[PDB]
Amino acid sequence: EAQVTQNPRYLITVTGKKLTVTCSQNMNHEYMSWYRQDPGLGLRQIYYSMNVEVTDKGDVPEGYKVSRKEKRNFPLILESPSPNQTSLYFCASSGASHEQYFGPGTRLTVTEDLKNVFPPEVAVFEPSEAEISHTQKATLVCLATGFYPDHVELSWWVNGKEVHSGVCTDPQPLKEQPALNDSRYALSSRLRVSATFWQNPRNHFRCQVQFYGLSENDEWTQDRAKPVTQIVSAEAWGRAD
């Protein structure tokens, strides 16, 4: 399980405030590079290091800076962050042969104002009586809406234990307002179980949505609750026929 380590994993910032995403690798690889990934553009190299104190700018380097004082680390510095630096960043290491080891990725969002950050609202919709008589299977639908940025993790928990069998979550969030640059997002997931399971009133279905928002450090002058990193849930209990 050794791998490339990226810290932080998620981050929201105001245009201007400088930031640095570090990247560690304990495999003694001399090669390290940063990549950004955007929809429709794929993976684009930013900078790359062939060895200690060796640095060369990749395809899209404007706005970024790196340093390679140590073999283990290859940080990425953005002096004056901008809205277009909003992206999914990856750090990679290469050693034996020339095989790439990618970090888990960093999701960075540079927003004009922190007043745009909203946590999700989660709701669970119970199985249709129609679907049960016609199919003998019950489908619950979890809806996570109005969150920004698009940084969420959703998961189902039945009777206190996580579930995988019978769930389908959208691969990526939906932009509620495609035409807006600061639009909020939605995500849905499905949990289908036999009609028998659903009819037991002792069964407990809970939808869990982890939001990555502000840190407890960020200032906040608005009235509504500070949109901090947090977990929001929603449940339903089995209903007898």
Binding site: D56, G105, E131, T139, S165, G166, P171
Partner: protein, 199 residues
């Protein structure tokens, strides 16, 4: 990383062979690696090839033809879980690493017993919305974004209940409008004519 990557997101039936062929440019290239990347995740090596030939690994086969200058990848017995973005990489004599066009593989799941239908899910004391579920349709169906700006639709997804040997597709649609009814929810989509609508 430019024009004429082969057009379209490659589609393949469940259980069928998937063939990806990518011609490359730099002749100085002599080492190729395949990477698989699921949507919001990081890319991961899945195949290495060194000499002009073939290499096997379970359901995968990677071909390299330096004569013609094309790298290929073949996945036997395609599973829907294979649906990802595949991209090849190489180390050129210039010391830098290059990632060529990345192709999107879409393995359509085999829906054994289709039962197209749109069900209306129970409101939540907590939420005001109404949600319509279009499920059990065959993989030959494509769902389309709604025409109205305030009725949300999510592309079809596949869920599998291992215990029953059952897979089912589904798309959700919701809205807080009163206009919204499950019968008009999916009109901007070519759904089977055999599509069920309860009561």
């Amino acid at each position: 990383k430019e024009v004429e990557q082969n057009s379209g997101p490659l589609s393949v039936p469940e259980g069928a062979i998937a063939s990806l062929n990518c011609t490359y440019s730099d002749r100085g290239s002599q080492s190729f690696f395949w990477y698989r990347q699921y949507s919001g995740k990081s890319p991961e090596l899945i195949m290495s090839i060194y000499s002009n030939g073939d290499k096997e690994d379970g359901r995968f086969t990677a071909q390299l033809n330096k004569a013609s200058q094309y790298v290929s990848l073949l996945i036997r017995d395609s599973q829907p879980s294979d649906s990802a973005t595949y991209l090849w990489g190489t180390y050129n004599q210039g010391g830098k690493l290059i990632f060529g066009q990345g192709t999107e593989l879409s393995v359509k799941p085999n829906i054994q017993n289709p039962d197209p239908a749109v069900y209306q899910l129970r409101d939540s004391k907590s939420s005001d919305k109404s949600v319509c579920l279009f499920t059990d349709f065959d993989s030959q169906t494509n769902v389309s974004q709604s025409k109205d700006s305030d009725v949300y639709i999510t592309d079809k997804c596949v869920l599998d209940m291992r215990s029953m040997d059952f897979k089912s597709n589904s798309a959700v649609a919701w809205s807080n409008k009163s206009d919204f009814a499950c019968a008009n929810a999916f009109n901007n989509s070519i759904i089977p004519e055999d599509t069920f609508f309860p009561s």
